[PDB]
Amino acid sequence: STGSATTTPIDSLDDAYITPVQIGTPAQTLNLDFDTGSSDLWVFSSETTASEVDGQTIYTPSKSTTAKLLSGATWSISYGDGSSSSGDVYTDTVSVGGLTVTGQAVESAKKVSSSFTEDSTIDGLLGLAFSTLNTVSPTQQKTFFDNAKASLDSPVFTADLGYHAPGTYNFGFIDTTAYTGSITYTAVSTKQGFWEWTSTGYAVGSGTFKSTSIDGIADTGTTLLYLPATVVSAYWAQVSGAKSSSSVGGYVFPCSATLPSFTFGVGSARIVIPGDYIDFGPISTGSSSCFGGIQSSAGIGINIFGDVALKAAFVVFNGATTPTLGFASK
Numbered sequence: 001s002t003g004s005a006t007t008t009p010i011d012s013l014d015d016a017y018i019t020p021v022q023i024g025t026p027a028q029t030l031n032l033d034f035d036t037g038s039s040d041l042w043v044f045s046s047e048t049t050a051s052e053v054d055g056q057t058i059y060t061p062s063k064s065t066t067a068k069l070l071s072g073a074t075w076s077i078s079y080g081d082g083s084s085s086s087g088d089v090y091t092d093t094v095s096v097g098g099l100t101v102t103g104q105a106v107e108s109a110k111k112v113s114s115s116f117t118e119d120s121t122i123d124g125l126l127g128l129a130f131s132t133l134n135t136v137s138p139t140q141q142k143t144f145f146d147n148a149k150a151s152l153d154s155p156v157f158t159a160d161l162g163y164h165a166p167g168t169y170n171f172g173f174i175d176t177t178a179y180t181g182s183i184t185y186t187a188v189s190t191k192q193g194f195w196e197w198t199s200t201g202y203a204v205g206s207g208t209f210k211s212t213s214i215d216g217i218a219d220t221g222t223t224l225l226y227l228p229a230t231v232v233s234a235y236w237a238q239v240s241g242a243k244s245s246s247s248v249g250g251y252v253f254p255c256s257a258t259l260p261s262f263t264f265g266v267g268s269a270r271i272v273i274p275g276d277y278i279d280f281g282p283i284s285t286g287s288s289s290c291f292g293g294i295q296s297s298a299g300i301g302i303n304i305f306g307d308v309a310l311k312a313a314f315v316v317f318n319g320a321t322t323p324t325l326g327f328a329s330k
């Protein structure tokens with residue numbers, strides 16, 4: 001089997017991407033944030049505190065003839081940004097672009113934090129990291145991709161995120177028309193449950209490539225690119241007026257700037273992030289100071305190749321016996 005769905009930025013800045021998912025019988029289509037940085041499939045529901053729901057489409061399990069309460073299961077998750085959600089669990093039928101899983105754990109939210117209530121475009125998350133991270137207790141549940149793996153023509157999914165434009169998630173196959181040149185595959189560690197890999201280095205603009213190991217995670221569920229303080233200082237040094245703001249909590253720069261590109265290494269290969277992709281608009285409406293799309297991973301504990309980096313690449317998440325990650329220019 002295979003599946004193919006379009007993913008769309010939620011706003012003019014690509015702060016996140018949503019992909020339509022069909023849940024239950026008959027189908028309830030909810031728009032989910034496909035997230036390679038977590039492992040819970042959780043949704044706004046008819047069980048969510050009415051004051052924490054504001055425009056999101058809700059999953060109503062009582063209306064699904066295939067939904068079944070998972071007796072005694074609860075879930076509770078907190079991402080390292082403040083946001084969090086929790087609730088109970090159902091198993092139901094879940095389809096993405098023609099690809100169908102029966103008995104997928106669908107984690108119904110009873111409480112969500114502010115960050116999610118505020119984003120009316122996002123009806124939940126579909127986690128695509130490793131099932132070891134799944135928070136359902138007392139019995140861990142499997143991610144959509146894991147449940148689907150055995151059925152796929154190939155145990156893979158690809159992420160093709162667009163810059164200020166629609167993109168594609170495919171399951172089961174690799175679209176050879178979607179990228180230029182060849183796909184460079186690099187090793188993955190699952191020890192922390194992420195698509196964790198090691199970049200061979202970086203360049204700032206047309207500056208000389210620096211070879212250095214940058215261990216980090218391929219994470220579609222994270223907006224920006226978080227890299228070490230040294231690397232990130234080397235980048236913003238090339239932008240006149242750029243500085244790190246405590247009041248803001250990261251590097252900001254003059255909106256009038258023309259940003260240089262950033263290159264990261266995948267083995268001998270190089271992915272080039274156009275300077276464009278690193279601009280995230282005024283820090284507040286009307287301001288001439290703009291938030292940068294590349295930030296320090298200093299108070300995080302791991303580097304994060306978020307959307308800013310992944311959207312410059314065609315990315316293969318290879319769930320074969322030894323998982324690997326693949327990157328191609330596009």
Ligand SMILES: O=C(CNCCc1c[nH]c2ccccc12)Nc1sc2c(c1C(=O)NCc1ccccc1)CCCC2
Pocket residue numbers: 016033035037038079080081083115116119122219221222223300301302304
């Ligand atoms: O958890 C994820 C991916 N999933 C994020 C889900 C999410 C949180 N808030 C949201 C708001 C809208 C849509 C989705 C989300 N990645 C991962 S993995 C990981 C972290 C994070 C993370 O929180 N990233 C986003 C972020 C990092 C730093 C500062 C601010 C934000 C930090 C500890 C090490 C391992």
